[PDB]
Amino acid sequence: MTTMNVLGTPLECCCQNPLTGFYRDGFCRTGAGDVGAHVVCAQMTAEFLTFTRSRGNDLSTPVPAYQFPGLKPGDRWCLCASRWREALEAGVAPPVILEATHASALEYVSLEDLKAHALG
Amino acid sequence: MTTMNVLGTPLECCCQNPLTGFYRDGFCRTGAGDVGAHVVCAQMTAEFLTFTRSRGNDLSTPVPAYQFPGLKPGDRWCLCASRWREALEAGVAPPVILEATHASALEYVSLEDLKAHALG
DSSP: OOOBBTTSSBOOOOOOSSOOSTTSSSSOOOOSSOSSOEEEEEEOOHHHHHHHHHHTOOOOSOBTTTTBOOOOTTOEEEEESHHHHHHHHTTOOOOBOGGGSBGGGGGTSOHHHHHHTSOO | OOOBBTTSSBOOOOOOSSOOSTTSSSSOOOOSSOSSOEEEEEEOOHHHHHHHHHHTOOOOSOBTTTTBOOOOTTOEEEEESHHHHHHHHTTOOOOBOGGGSBGGGGGTSOHHHHHHTSOO
């Protein structure tokens, strides 16, 4: 049974801002529109913010087109695998939450380097 | 198809702290353990924080038993319907996000007073 809200639609996240996932449903799930594969749920560290900006991947500078204030460190986010696997081999990979990162991350990296950099 | 994480489990929320829902999955869904029916996704206002505390429902004072820092205003949360319907007839009801509140809230209040106090 699909679980339902007052309006008659499927119940959505009662999420905090900032809202996550490429489809803004709260989930590092991937799909058609995305080609970046934002399947890694990471916690933002200022080093990584700084590192990926340099690579062509600034996730820091706010932009309220969508109403998207950028990302403070400590905030969670769905990042491209390739954009994380960069910070991994550059020794600056941010802490990942594995139950929140899609299975296809493993087509990019291994469980072991993911586990390696978990949050505990 | 149930969507999956690296570990082999269903993909969870890539949520921000504070984490929401009675079952800490991010959703104002209800179920067996809960008898409070925390089915209303509201945004915290200091007045309401203050109002419900007085009624026997302090959601403000932190408690790291669970590691639960309490609730700043502006934060989202799953509140009992009865604890909201209190603030409604006491003219101090906090702003609700309807796509994020369970259908059974309507066994407590109406769409119209919910809609009335949406976020837009």
